[PDB]
Amino acid sequence: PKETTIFAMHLGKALDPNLPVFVKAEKDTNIKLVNVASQNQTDQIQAYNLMLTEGKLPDIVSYELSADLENLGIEGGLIPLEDLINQHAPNLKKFFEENPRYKKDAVAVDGHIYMIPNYYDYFNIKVSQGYFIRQDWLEKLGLKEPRTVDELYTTLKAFREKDPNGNGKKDEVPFFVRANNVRKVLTSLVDLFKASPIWYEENGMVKYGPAQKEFKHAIKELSKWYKEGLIDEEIFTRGLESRDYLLSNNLGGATDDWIASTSSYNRNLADKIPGFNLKLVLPYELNGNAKTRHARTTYLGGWGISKDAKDPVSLIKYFDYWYSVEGRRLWNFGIEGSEYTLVDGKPVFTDKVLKNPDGKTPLAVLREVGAQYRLGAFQDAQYELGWASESAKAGYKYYMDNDVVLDELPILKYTKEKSKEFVSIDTAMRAVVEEKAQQWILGSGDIDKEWDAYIKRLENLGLSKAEQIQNEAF
Ligand SMILES: CC(=O)N[C@@H]1[C@@H](O[C@@H]2OC(C(=O)O)=C[C@H](O)[C@H]2O)[C@@H](OS(=O)(=O)O)[C@@H](COS(=O)(=O)O)O[C@H]1O
Ligand SMILES: [Ca+2]
């Protein structure tokens, strides 16, 4: 065993190296992680920024924001990995040969690799969230499946007014989302209206979604729907438990959320709510547009080796372990004999994952054992196919075949100087967007009177300078 310090968090939770997956990795690698993030920290961004101030860097630095990792590397806080990989990491070396896009994702603008991304299995599943509705409530109310945003409005109003859960109470929550910050609330609300709260691509050009006319229209409509009780009153204040809470209590009528986990509730709730059918639909059309911008990026965050690590060779071998057949299987599937067994040589999940007795989704079970824990690993779509229901599996194909998903932006890279300029604009604009969007949706103020002042407000923070940086990076 080697004590190896790490800064690692994901989904609000510091890595516990005694989770089943990491106990197995420790046994296979002789690397014993010790986390410098503590079990009480939940805000990964603030924990990371604080961690940079605390003297020596941990041996391994994992982080959800890859530009900050490349900046740390340009400053000399993380070391270049590409020669270590060449000499000592045959699995990563092979992976970079077989995957040009992923290799390009790992190279900073100065030509060094400062981090190994945590890659989605992007070329096998790139769809992410999809639109779902209570087909059993549609049938109960004799309603057609809505296809346009206007039809969705009519349906959600019916869900609010007509007691589809049959209890004589006006408790229905027609539309809800699942989010742990305001940006992610907006993400699952404004895409209905073909708007975006982030930067996106239009024909090779990068634009800022909150400055676009579609966003104004999205906020105006959401304001109306919120006043009429069509949108969850508590939309900005629930955490990630919203979906479990609203579905298991038979309150939620419709959502926009990840396809496999959201599809898991039909089987999960089949006994507590007879006939529960939360069904995938294609994105609703608005003025001829049937597209969704919900898509995976090629990766999310990454991890690197700091200049303070006394044995960087043994750490790149640790990084490489996760790209071996057994390491990548462990990271994705959990523990052989517990989460899965090998059937005809390939993992098949057990009832512990597929039919959890407390009603956890399969993914929530896997996260409990330390699987899918974002670091610098390569997700295997065979794991997602392993637990996805038949209707989730058909639904990836339904979204792909109908061509409704717009590809996400590549993760953009910067020099350290351009990153510093961009974030001082981008983070300030973010705060304005989130302040005004909540204010407008919650019904204070008036977007029509206020829009032009808001746009000017973004411009005065440097909107056009950030637009220039984003287009140079793309
Ligand atoms: C790389 C990573 O961990 N991504 C998180 C998402 O995990 C995906 O979730 C699902 C699914 O829900 O069907 C399928 C993919 O295999 C997973 O990589 C997801 O995590 S979570 O388990 O739902 O919490 C999102 C959730 O955050 S959100 O509701 O705010 O989008 O977080 C991504 O980190
Ligand atoms: Ca009711």
Residue numbers in the entry: 27 to 500
Quoted passage from the original study:
The solute-binding protein (Smon0123) captures GAG disaccharides in the periplasm and delivers them to the ABC transporter, followed by their import in the cytoplasm. The ABC transporter comprises membrane-spanning proteins (Smon0121-Smon0122) as heterodimers and ATPase domains (Smon0120-Smon0120) as homodimers. Similar to other solute-binding proteins, Smon0123 has two major N and C domains that are connected via a flexible hinge and that captures the substrates via a mechanism called the “Venus’s flytrap”. Because of a large molecular size (57 kDa) and EF hand-like calcium-binding site, Smon0123 should also be added to the 7th cluster.
The purified Smon0123 (N-18/C-5) was crystallized in the presence of CΔ4S6S, and the resultant crystal was suitable for determining the structure. The refined model contained four monomers in an asymmetric unit while the biological unit was monomer. In the complex crystal structure of Smon0123 with CΔ4S6S, the substrate CΔ4S6S was bound to a cleft between the N and C domains. Far from the cleft, a calcium ion was bound to the C1 subdomain. Two positively charged residues, Arg204 and Arg393, were directly bound to the sulfate group at the C-4 position. Lys210 directly formed hydrogen bonds with the sulfate group at the C-6 position. Moreover, aromatic residues such as Tyr146 and Trp284 interacted with the pyranose ring of the substrate. On the other hand, the magnitude of the hinge-bending motion of the Smon0123/CΔ4S6S structure was determined to be 39°. Therefore, two sulfate groups in CΔ4S6S shifted the arrangements of amino acid residues in the C1 subdomain, resulting in conformational changes in Smon0123/CΔ4S6S owing to the movement of the C domain. As a result, the enhancement of its ATPase activity in the presence of CΔ4S6S was lower than that of CΔ0S and CΔ4S, suggesting that CΔ4S6S-bound Smon0123 in the 39°-closed conformation is unpreferable for docking with the ABC transporter compared to that in the 47°-closed conformation.
